[PDB]
Structures are given as C-alpha cells and as structure tokens.
Design a protein around this ligand. Structure first.
Ligand SMILES: NC(=O)C1=CN([C@@H]2O[C@H](COP(=O)(O)OP(=O)(O)OC[C@H]3O[C@@H](n4cnc5c(N)ncnc54)[C@H](OP(=O)(O)O)[C@@H]3O)[C@@H](O)[C@H]2O)C=CC1
Ligand SMILES: NC(=O)C1=CN([C@@H]2O[C@H](COP(=O)(O)OP(=O)(O)OC[C@H]3O[C@@H](n4cnc5c(N)ncnc54)[C@H](OP(=O)(O)O)[C@@H]3O)[C@@H](O)[C@H]2O)C=CC1
Ligand SMILES: Cc1cn([C@H]2C[C@H](O)[C@@H](COP(=O)(O)OP(=O)(O)O[C@H]3O[C@@H](C)[C@H](O)[C@@H](O)[C@H]3O)O2)c(=O)[nH]c1=O
Ligand SMILES: Cc1cn([C@H]2C[C@H](O)[C@@H](COP(=O)(O)OP(=O)(O)O[C@H]3O[C@@H](C)[C@H](O)[C@@H](O)[C@H]3O)O2)c(=O)[nH]c1=O
Ligand SMILES: [Mg+2]
Lengths: 298, 298
C-alpha cells in the first residue's frame, strides 16, 4: 500500500521518512520536489499530485510554522496551513484515502493550570494557531477518514528547534535570559513519527479511530527548566559551555510579535487508549537527541 | 505492558530505545547496568533480571558480534550468544513472555546465486555463526513464544560499521583496496528497530507469528559497490575525500581469521507477508545515515 509524504525534510518529516518506510510503499516529497509537486503555496498543485499518485495514505508534515513571521505574512500561512490542506483533504476523500495531518496546541488560548483536552473549546491567541485551526476544521469537513495530531514544542536532532537555538547561545554566552511561566511538554520528531506509523496501521484495520488526537510527550515543564536540563546535559557531556549566570523570567518581561499561550499542557489520554500506545516522559526524548548531538566525531 | 531491553547502546539497540518507547513501558539496560544486571557473560545474572522484572516482552540486542575475535575467544561467544540466550529464554517461558532476539546470516554457508530461505539448511562456515545458531536453536527449544530476526550487514549512524570504517580510510587515503565477490544486503539499525516494534504488536495479538524470520533490507549488493556508493555520497556532499584510485577485489586475495560466506543474500518474503510490512531497497537506508553524518555542524 501507498503512502504519500509532504514536508519530508522538516523535523517530523525527516523522521517519517524512516518510520513510514516499512509501513508501506513511500513517495516522499518537499517544496523543491521537481518531478512531482510538493509546493503547499499552490493548493491546486498539491491537490494535483494527490489525485496524480492516488495514495492509500497521505502524511502531511509540510506546513507554514514560522509563527511570528505568520503574523506579518498571514494570508500565506492560510495558503499553506488551511487552503492547501483543505484542497489535499477534498482530493483524498475522492480516492477514499487516509489523510494524516499535524496541528498545534496554539489552537488553544492561555488560561493555565488544568491540562487541555480534545473536546475542549478552541480560541487561538495568535495567527499560526487560528490558520492551523482552520486547516484542521477544513480537513475535518472534507475528509472524515483523517488523522489529526495536535502536538507541541516539537524538536528533532536535524532541524531548528528551541534546544538547538538555546544551546548555540549558551556556548557563545556568559550570562543568559529565558521564560519560566509557560507550562508545556517538549515532543520529539522521533516520537511523533513512530506513533504516526503505529496509528496508520491501526486506522487501516479500524476506521473508527479516525478523528482528532492530542499527541505530545509525557509530563510537563517550563521553557526555562527545559533549557536548564539542556545545559546540564551539555555540561554532563564535558562541554565548556560559556554560561556562568543562568537567568529565569515570567513571559511578558520580553516581547514577541505573536501572542504565545501560557497553558500549553496537552492531555493525551485519548491517544493512549485509542492506539494502545505509550507516550513517555519528555526528558527521555530530549536526552536522546542531545546524546546524539554531543557524539561529535566524523 | 512491560518491555525489557538488553544491548541498548549498540547499533540496533540504540534504535530500539527509540522504537520500543511508545510500544510499551521500557526498561533499557547494558553490560555496565549498575542497579540491574545487563551482563551477558553471566547467564544466570541476565536470567535473574528477567525473572526479577517479569517483562511482557524481552528484546535482546545484546550479543558477542566481534566475529574474527570470536574465533580466538569462542567459549566467550558461546557464553553470550548461546548460554545467556538459552538462560534468558528458559526464564521468559516461565512468565510466558515474548523473547525477541537477533541472529545472523553467517548461520548459512557460502554456495552463491539463489537467495537464502528460512526453511533452508544451516551450515555455519565460522564460529560467530555456529555459536549464534546454537543460541537461536536454544531459544527455539526453551521458549516457543519467541521472535528471531536473522539479519545481515547491519549499520547505524551511531556505532561501528562497514560504511563508518570504510569512509575513515577513504578520507585518509589516496589509493584503496576492498571486496567485490561477497553478495548481500546492508540493513539499517533503524529498519531493524522499526520493524521490531511493529512485529511485537502483531505477535501480542497473533501468537501464530512466533518463529524465525529473515529480516534484511531489500535487494542485494557487493561490499565493493556498497563502499563505492558510500564514496559517491561523500563526494556528493562536497567532501574532499583523499581517494583518487578505488580498487575492487575477489575475497580470497585478502585474509580474514574467520571464514566469511560468499552468499549472504537473505530472502525475506516470509517477514513481509507475516507482518504486513515493507522492506525497502538497501541504498535508501544507507543514504539516510550518510546524510545525517554529513550534516556536520553543532
Ligand atoms: N515545530 C513545532 O514545534 C510544531 C509543529 N507542528 C506541526 O507539525 C508538523 C511538522 O512540524 P515541524 O516538522 O516541527 O516543522 P518544520 O518547519 O521542521 O516542517 C514544516 C515543513 O514545511 C515546509 N514548508 C515551508 N514552506 C512550504 C511550502 N510553501 N510548501 C511545502 N512545504 C513548505 C518546510 O520547509 P522549509 O521552510 O525548510 O522550506 C518544512 O519542511 C506541521 O504540521 C506543523 O504545523 C505543530 C505544532 C508544533
Ligand atoms: N552488526 C551486524 O552486522 C549484525 C548483527 N546481528 C545481531 O543483531 C543484534 C545487534 O547487532 P548490533 O547492534 O549490530 O551489534 P553491536 O555490537 O552494535 O551490539 C551488540 C551489543 O552487545 C554488547 N555486549 C558486548 N559484550 C557484552 C556482554 N558481555 N554483555 C552484554 N552486552 C554485551 C555490546 O556492547 P560493547 O561491546 O560496546 O560493550 C553491544 O551493545 C545482535 O544479536 C547481533 O548478533 C546479526 C547479524 C549482523
Ligand atoms: C526571543 C526569545 C525567545 N525565548 C523563548 C521564548 C519562547 O516561549 C520560546 C519558544 O521558542 P520557539 O519554539 O522558537 O517559538 P515557536 O513559535 O517556533 O514555538 C512554537 O512553534 C509552534 C510551531 C508550536 O505549535 C509550539 O508548540 C512551539 O514549538 O523561546 C526566550 O526565552 N528568550 C528570548 O529572548
Ligand atoms: C580487512 C579488510 C576488510 N574488508 C571488508 C571485507 C569484509 O567482507 C567486509 C565486512 O566487514 P565487517 O562488516 O567489519 O566484518 P564483520 O564480521 O563485523 O561483518 C559481519 O558481522 C556480523 C556481525 C554479521 O552477521 C554480518 O552480516 C556482517 O555484518 O570488510 C576489506 O574490504 N578490505 C580489507 O582489507
Ligand atoms: Mg535518528
């Protein structure tokens, strides 16, 4: 059976190249796909390739995910995160194909404490989340044989993330400043991709699991304590990390163009029972990518 | 459900840490496991931890795999590859636990051309293969709720392999010399680990798949052409690879302590239909680890 993949060079995407490889026959494409259209800024183009290949399963790891830039260029985010997905969905539903699609917790507003659920109310603080929410609604309404994975604080060892950018700073710098109020759960590309593969195989054999799932690594943490642990691991790996004065903060002290949510604690209890899958503590995943990075010899 | 893993720091093993993480609750251990015995040179010790944790599933990625060294130190290979496995199996069967275990094509003799099957005859040319064959027979006879994965030419991006050692040479050297007669299929840790995860989930729900499976990447190739492609990829990634004169060879021109088989073409048609899984062409897997290696910035 035929799997079709977009956004193959991204974090998740690069990992789905590995994870989907045995699940079924894999065509993997990106923006720069030359013999085949993987360009999300052309909804009809990506719609044409879905129609053109007739995939059994479609994994969409392509997107517009430049959150702050999206506020400045929103109509483009709409094209990528709503319009192309909408088109992709409507195409998929003609061939009866499963559409797998990634979404975000930025769908939710802040308002902290209790962790967010799949049947909870949606009020996007920012554009990224408003646009992406449209995409998941658009998919929801054009193709019910869909799988939507709302995730958060996504990192991978190959591709830009918080731990990547945070570490670069820490090696260069003596004294550093970052957020301690934003509660949430860092989630690996590896986990996303591995669970995706297992989820697909369940869905094929049980269409009932079609729907919306909150899929994020276990537990919760702050961007601060996220970064602290990142440093301990750098430290642990003997690296002379320039940092001698680590400084915590509450959000609003430092500006960002888009409004970030304060309560990014997603509840995944649905995914676990539905797919019979485990979702381990966020740290483990993080230490794993860091170990691989700190193995620095060619 | 509880998964138990040995040889977690090896090629396959490190990848199983990732792949098993969502399949079930994961205890991962090695030789140097301190609060828990992951030392295969003590069969009773590793037997004690199986009994001690009572795992639902046991993945054994630990082994003695130093093939030439094994000829010199065979009684030790027996301890690791036969004795400990035997013990592990017999323990597992008391708790009714699935034993997952990796084996080799070195189980087979040379005698080329036609690709090797699961119900074909076994005549190990070398010790490694003779010892490992004992282990898989020992497991076969103490624990029928087992999964045996005979693989070959196993590489990974973290841990020593042919492509790793071949490349080191090529960057250092002008003129280089390697084998073109040994036919076989390079197989990633990633693939091994990903398929293992899917296989476990099938086995739980269908005990009938218990048995012996040839699990190796698709197609076939020579160690020479393996290495050539490795260089093209190094070259392709702009690397000034010292190599100006690449030299092919037929086996016997260069000595090795152990006898290597000439026909390492494994047939995997059984695995594919039994697990409903795909086993893609060997190149893809290889290019993937190489791309990740040639992404050289921290
Ligand atoms: N990163 C995170 O923390 C989060 C991600 N997600 C979702 O998970 C999925 C994957 O995330 P992740 O892998 O982290 O994000 P990445 O940015 O790493 O991947 C998104 C992909 O979209 C590609 N892309 C950009 N513009 C276009 C375009 N016009 N046409 C086609 N592709 C394009 C990007 O490539 P490039 O820009 O390099 O050309 C990239 O390959 C997406 O749906 C995303 O919204 C959800 C919440 C969290
Ligand atoms: N590499 C290949 O091409 C092949 C591998 N296989 C099988 O696949 C499985 C994994 O292979 P692979 O991951 O490639 O091999 P690795 O050598 O990378 O892994 C084997 C593991 O065994 C560990 N080990 C060595 N001595 C002991 C000991 N006394 N007690 C416990 N662990 C020990 C090794 O660690 P360390 O030595 O670093 O301490 C290592 O973690 C094994 O069953 C192997 O036989 C089969 C055929 C092909
Ligand atoms: C500029 C700056 C940022 N930061 C921190 C604040 C932010 O809350 C934190 C997170 O940074 P980024 O992950 O780069 O922002 P981002 O918008 O890319 O993050 C989000 O991307 C979406 C695609 C996801 O749905 C989210 O789950 C999340 O990953 O970086 C500082 O601590 N100090 C600073 O000076
Ligand atoms: C010394 C030397 C080796 N080589 C090549 C010859 C060998 O056939 C080739 C393979 O090397 P290695 O993989 O290091 O040998 P090895 O014994 O570790 O290889 C085997 O390990 C077992 C664990 C597996 O079951 C096998 O499938 C295979 O991976 O290296 C040369 O080409 N030129 C040389 O001068
Ligand atoms: Mg990896």
């Amino acid at each position: 059976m035929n799997i079709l993949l977009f956004g193959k060079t991204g974090q998740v995407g690069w990992e789905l190249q590995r994870s989907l490889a045995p699940v079924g026959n894999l065509i993997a494409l990106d923006v720069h796909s030359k013999e085949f259209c993987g360009d999300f800024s052309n909804p009809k183009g990506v719609a044409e390739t879905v129609r053109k290949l007739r995939p059994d399963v479609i994994v969409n790891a392509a997107a517009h995910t430049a959150v702050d830039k999206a506020e400045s260029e929103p109509e483009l985010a709409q094209l990528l995160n709503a319009t192309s997905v909408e088109a992709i969905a409507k195409a998929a539903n003609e061939t009866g194909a499963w559409v797998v699609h990634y979404s975000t917790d930025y769908v939710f507003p802040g308002t902290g404490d209790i962790p967010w659920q799949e049947t909870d109310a949606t009020s996007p603080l920012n554009v990224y989340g408003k646009t992406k929410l449209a995409g998941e609604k658009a998919l929801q309404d054009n193709c019910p044989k869909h799988l939507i994975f709302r995730t958060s604080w996504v990192y991978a060892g190959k591709g830009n993330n918080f731990a990547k950018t945070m570490l670069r700073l820490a090696k260069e710098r003596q004294t550093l400043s970052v957020i301690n109020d934003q509660y949430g759960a860092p989630t690996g590309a590896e986990l996303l991709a591995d669970c995706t593969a297992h989820a697909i195989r369940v869905a094929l054999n049980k269409p009932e699991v079609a729907g919306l799932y909150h899929l994020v690594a276990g537990g919760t943490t702050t961007w601060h304590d996220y970064a602290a642990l990142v440093f301990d691991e750098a430290r642990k790996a003997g690296i002379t990390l320039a940092l001698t004065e680590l400084n915590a903060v509450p959000t609003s002290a430092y500006p960002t163009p888009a409004s970030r949510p304060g309560n990014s604690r997603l509840n995944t209890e649905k995914f676990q029972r539905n797919f019979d899958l485990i979702l381990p503590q966020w740290e483990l995943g993080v230490k794993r990518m860091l170990t691989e990075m700190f193995t620095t010899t060619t």
